[PDB]
Amino acid sequence: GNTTSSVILTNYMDTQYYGEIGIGTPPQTFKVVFDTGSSNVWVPSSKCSRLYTACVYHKLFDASDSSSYKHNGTELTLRYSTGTVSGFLSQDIITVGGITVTQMFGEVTEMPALPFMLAEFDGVVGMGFIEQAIGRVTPIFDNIISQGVLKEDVFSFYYNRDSENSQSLGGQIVLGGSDPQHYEGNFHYINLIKTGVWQIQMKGVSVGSSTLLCEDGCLALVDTGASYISGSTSSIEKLMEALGAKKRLFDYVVKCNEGPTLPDISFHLGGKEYTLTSADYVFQESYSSKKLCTLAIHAMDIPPPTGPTWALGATFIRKFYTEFDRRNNRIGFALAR
Amino acid sequence: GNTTSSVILTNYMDTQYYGEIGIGTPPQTFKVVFDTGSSNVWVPSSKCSRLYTACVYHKLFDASDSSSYKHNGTELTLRYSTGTVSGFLSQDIITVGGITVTQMFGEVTEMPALPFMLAEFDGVVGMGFIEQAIGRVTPIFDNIISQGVLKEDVFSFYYNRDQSLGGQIVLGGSDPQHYEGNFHYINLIKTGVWQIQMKGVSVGSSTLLCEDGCLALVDTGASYISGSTSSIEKLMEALGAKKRLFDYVVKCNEGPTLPDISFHLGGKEYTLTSADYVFQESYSSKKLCTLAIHAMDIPPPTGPTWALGATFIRKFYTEFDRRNNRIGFALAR
Ligand SMILES: CNC[C@H](CC1CCCCC1)NC(=O)N1CCC[C@@H]([C@@](O)(CCCNC(C)=O)c2cccc(Cl)c2)C1
Ligand SMILES: CNC[C@H](CC1CCCCC1)NC(=O)N1CCC[C@@H]([C@@](O)(CCCNC(C)=O)c2cccc(Cl)c2)C1
Ligand SMILES: CNC[C@H](CC1CCCCC1)NC(=O)N1CCC[C@@H]([C@@](O)(CCCNC(C)=O)c2cccc(Cl)c2)C1
Ligand SMILES: CNC[C@H](CC1CCCCC1)NC(=O)N1CCC[C@@H]([C@@](O)(CCCNC(C)=O)c2cccc(Cl)c2)C1
Ligand SMILES: *[C@@H]1O[C@H](CO)[C@@H](O[C@@H]2O[C@H](CO)[C@@H](O)[C@H](O)[C@H]2NC(C)=O)[C@H](O)[C@H]1NC(C)=O
Ligand SMILES: *[C@@H]1O[C@H](CO)[C@@H](O)[C@H](O)[C@H]1NC(C)=O
Known part of the structure; x- marks a missing residue:
């Protein structure tokens, strides 16, 4: 067909x-x-x-x-x-x-x-x-x-x-x-760890130019049902400490003024950097030093066999148009527009 | 009157x-x-x-x-x-x-x-x-x-x-229809807050937290008992519980033999058995049962503090006393 x-x-x-x-x-x-x-x-x-x-x-x-x-x-x-x-x-x-x-x-x-x-x-x-x-x-x-x-x-x-x-x-x-209207350039393809789950290895996650989390490798589920990007509690605690973010009941936050100057977060995927800026990952309702702004990221401990593992959800997918390929058991990423 | x-x-x-x-x-x-x-x-x-x-x-x-x-x-x-x-x-x-x-x-x-x-x-x-x-x-x-x-x-x-x-x-x-024996009365720390001193949180016979003192807000609007993120992480380790997005859970069959948790308040031990703090919706090893306890970081001036919510109050009928600036607990019935 x-x-x-x-x-x-x-x-x-x-x-x-x-x-x-x-x-x-x-x-x-x-x-x-x-x-x-x-x-x-x-x-x-x-x-x-x-x-x-x-x-x-x-x-x-x-x-x-x-x-x-x-x-x-x-x-x-x-x-x-x-x-x-x-x-x-x-x-x-x-x-x-x-x-x-x-x-x-x-x-x-x-x-x-x-x-x-x-x-x-x-x-x-x-x-x-x-x-x-x-x-x-x-x-x-x-x-x-x-x-x-x-x-x-x-x-x-x-x-x-x-x-x-x-x-x-x-x-x-x-x-x-x-749909080429919605992405630019060509797809970078990453092979699945295995058939059966939309999951890939990740080499690292960098905060600023420093590959500080996941330094010896970890998993990523590309998960179009996840609203935020999520990682394990231990990973997220370290990531958030690195940003200076504070944990509330349901989110992590930074003073809204501090948002735009937070460091980039990059996900090392199939030997490339998938970089989200603080414009990509902070909900900036305002830029007030008196207001707190939510980060589109949290801790979610996914239990084995799927986890532990990050989930690259809508925070990530917004930037990166995502192709899920059943014939070749791969995922392609291109820059969205 | x-x-x-x-x-x-x-x-x-x-x-x-x-x-x-x-x-x-x-x-x-x-x-x-x-x-x-x-x-x-x-x-x-x-x-x-x-x-x-x-x-x-x-x-x-x-x-x-x-x-x-x-x-x-x-x-x-x-x-x-x-x-x-x-x-x-x-x-x-x-x-x-x-x-x-x-x-x-x-x-x-x-x-x-x-x-x-x-x-x-x-x-x-x-x-x-x-x-x-x-x-x-x-x-x-x-x-x-x-x-x-x-x-x-x-x-x-x-x-x-x-x-x-x-x-x-x-x-x-x-109401005496709902508690048994006598109230044990404990001073508030200050007026302004339904908060009392606590002098330890024990798991079985092991004081594990709050060794040198911490605070307990007696908080009828809290659904679970809550503690600071760090205290709850330590308590949950002692219990073998796993964190999920919204709760801490044990396998349901492991529920009944969890150790007691005790709150040392006004010189006496207030103990909850695992029947009191595990929601036993099932006893199956194939199922995960939620604990009625979680983390909540309550900000200054009021916190860091524990919050004794409904999990605690179900067992201990609680009187809030404005004349004497104290709280009393009696065993609910
Ligand atoms: C398995 N793959 C990840 C799962 C998928 C989820 C789908 C609904 C049934 C439950 C499973 N998601 C997920 O574990 N989480 C965290 C919890 C809140 C979710 C979510 O925010 C996501 C909404 C749908 N997502 C998008 C991007 O459109 C949500 C919001 C409000 C109510 C509800 Cl029921 C769920 C996002
Ligand atoms: C752009 N607007 C941003 C605001 C910010 C918000 C922060 C917390 C409290 C105040 C409002 N609102 C928001 O972001 N919301 C709405 C409510 C449900 C959230 C969310 O759907 C998030 C799932 C995230 N995690 C995944 C995907 O793994 C959700 C669903 C069910 C329960 C809970 Cl606690 C949270 C998603
Ligand atoms: C300050 N004093 C503790 C606060 C009080 C709360 C009163 C309602 C508005 C918000 C403040 N509670 C609380 O911080 N937490 C943790 C968060 C969820 C709560 C709660 O489970 C509490 C249910 C009310 N409690 C009982 C025993 O009836 C809940 C559930 C669903 C929706 C909502 Cl809006 C709130 C329990
Ligand atoms: C007896 N049935 C037990 C089940 C257990 C349920 C837990 C989630 C996953 C597994 C099933 N259901 C329950 O326990 N529920 C209902 C939903 C709102 C919860 C809760 O009220 C608990 C507040 C706790 N923290 C306090 C009080 O300081 C809550 C959770 C998230 C957001 C909001 Cl607004 C409110 C309380
Ligand atoms: C509902 O789904 C189940 C699973 O497919 C169907 O059960 C199978 O049906 C046929 C019998 O006609 C058998 O060959 C299989 O052994 C059945 N599997 C199991 C696990 O029992 C079932 O028939 C379907 N139900 C209806 C009402 O049609
Ligand atoms: C509302 O109540 C306050 C009490 O401090 C009072 O000063 C104020 O005038 C009231 N406003 C109106 C419109 O009555």
Whole structure:
């Protein structure tokens, strides 16, 4: 086949990026995060009790309204480190761009307020591999590949910084290729450590010209579902000490005046420096010496086998257009625009 | 005189405990946390923009629906752990149990989704001292003290584990239906703060922290027990717990044989077993169970300090005594 296919994302405040998918006949539409850190598709279910406020606020899939729905009912429990969701397996046709595919997905009936009452999206489309898929359900991109409609077995992500203009594209995922409007130059390719997770070795992370963390090597998950860049508690503590940043309940902060003069942070990837400046990684709500500004970075201890490991999320992806390549088990990075 | 008065609390999932107050004529009712760690009363305002999701899902105070509302309008900003809420000052009559009082409170018009889209409660009634009150507003308990109605100038807290009563605050005394034996009374460090000296935190029989002294804020608005980041890192090591983004956990099967944790307060050991501080949702080795304890760096002047929150209070019924500037603990029942 010869399909490239694009899906427009809305950017909520530079921490959530989601697009629309349609499930069923006729399609019930859902806002979903496309998460290379996970491999299951789920949406909240019309069987989810209104005891879960997340099921009052979000859109719900009603199977009995879909003529292509096929019952399964097997339990599914997705125990993310942030919060477990539970429900049951269902099968139906899922539209993503112009691409239609019969997919097994979770109908979610338990959805905790932390974190789901903070979510502007309803559901998740896991773009990881079957090796991370709970209950061994074939992931949506695998079923898309089997169709043999795509140009290349690749998909790609553009995340934009949030802008005022109702005309601004929040972001874009391309299935089957990448979109040259959204990056400059050529891709630098980095081989996966292994098939099964979107993860690469990293040689180092430099604060200023000094490669002070990860000096003897570490892992990086390129994780389009992570809002911030994250590293292990021990790494992040050292990084933050290096910036002079203070830990609060939910973020790290610097006085907003001090932001622009913080040193660059560079991630040494496939033998190149991926550099974020303090313009890339500090939310500068202002430049007041009396105000504190959040860094788009925190500590998240990912448990083995995936961790310990950094996650290069939206903070990183905004600068670097990211191509996830299934045929060659590699990730390409180019400079976004 | 002679008034005591109780407010029944709803227990939401062992982490939020909130009762009802009525503000205005007729009374508009709010779910509120009674927080000994702060000193302002506030509720969300009808003024709050529906852009704040928290103002859609929470009860809103509409000042024009009350014949007792008196305008004021001073800007108000409250800084908590979780961040800031903004609004302005209004005055009205507030009902808390059988007691009615004229109270200046905040009508909040800015309520960030993190954290307020997590709260079952609508607002907060500060039970702390005027010293800690923002914009120098007289705290509700001082207003109630001025009325000469309370039996004794004390109030007290019972928090249940999720019997049927979620909890109870008594204004003017303590309820014997909810504690057993006698109170042990401990001086406050200073007026201005519901904070006492602590002289050690032990894990089993091993004092591990606070050997030379530290502070314990007795903090009814805290869901867990909290300590400084460094003390909690050391405590969690002793317990074999692992940090995750939002919690510390042990494997659920390891829960029951964790050692006791003890707080040395007013010369006696206040001990929590692992049944008291591990949320045992399961006992499976395949599952991770959250500890009802975390880090919170509380800033000067008040901190560094521990905060004895609901995890502690479930076991120890607590009396806050303004006449004597002390706290008493009795074993809850
Ligand atoms: C596995 N791969 C990383 C995971 C993926 C996550 C997807 C939702 C289900 C839970 C798993 N992410 C992640 O562990 N973290 C930290 C916790 C908060 C997340 C997040 O901020 C991310 C939102 C979606 N991300 C983007 C860039 O659009 C969030 C915010 C508010 C509510 C909720 Cl439920 C989650 C970001
Ligand atoms: C551009 N605006 C910036 C402001 C700054 C913010 C800092 C903390 C308190 C004040 C507001 N807001 C922000 O950044 N927000 C919104 C709320 C949820 C955050 C976040 O989604 C972040 C996940 C980060 N970590 C990953 C990806 O590994 C989240 C979700 C669930 C729980 C928690 Cl504690 C935090 C993301
Ligand atoms: C100053 N005194 C301690 C403060 C008090 C708090 C009062 C409400 C507004 C913010 C200040 N609490 C506190 O610093 N922490 C840690 C952060 C989360 C809190 C909390 O879990 C507390 C629940 C209230 N507590 C009980 C027992 O009912 C929570 C949960 C979900 C949403 C929100 Cl807004 C807050 C518990
Ligand atoms: C009995 N059920 C137990 C489960 C355990 C849950 C923990 C997260 C991952 C695993 C499951 N749920 C719980 O424990 N919850 C509910 C969510 C809000 C938490 C909490 O209220 C705790 C505050 C703690 N710190 C204090 C008080 O000083 C919280 C956490 C993050 C942000 C905000 Cl605003 C509020 C308290
Ligand atoms: C739901 O999904 C499960 C997993 O695919 C299906 O179970 C398999 O189905 C066939 C029997 O028709 C067997 O060959 C496999 O052994 C089954 N696997 C397991 C793990 O039991 C199940 O049939 C599907 N459910 C429905 C209702 O169609
Ligand atoms: C609000 O209350 C304060 C109390 O200090 C008072 O001085 C001020 O005049 C009040 N404002 C109005 C408009 O009444």
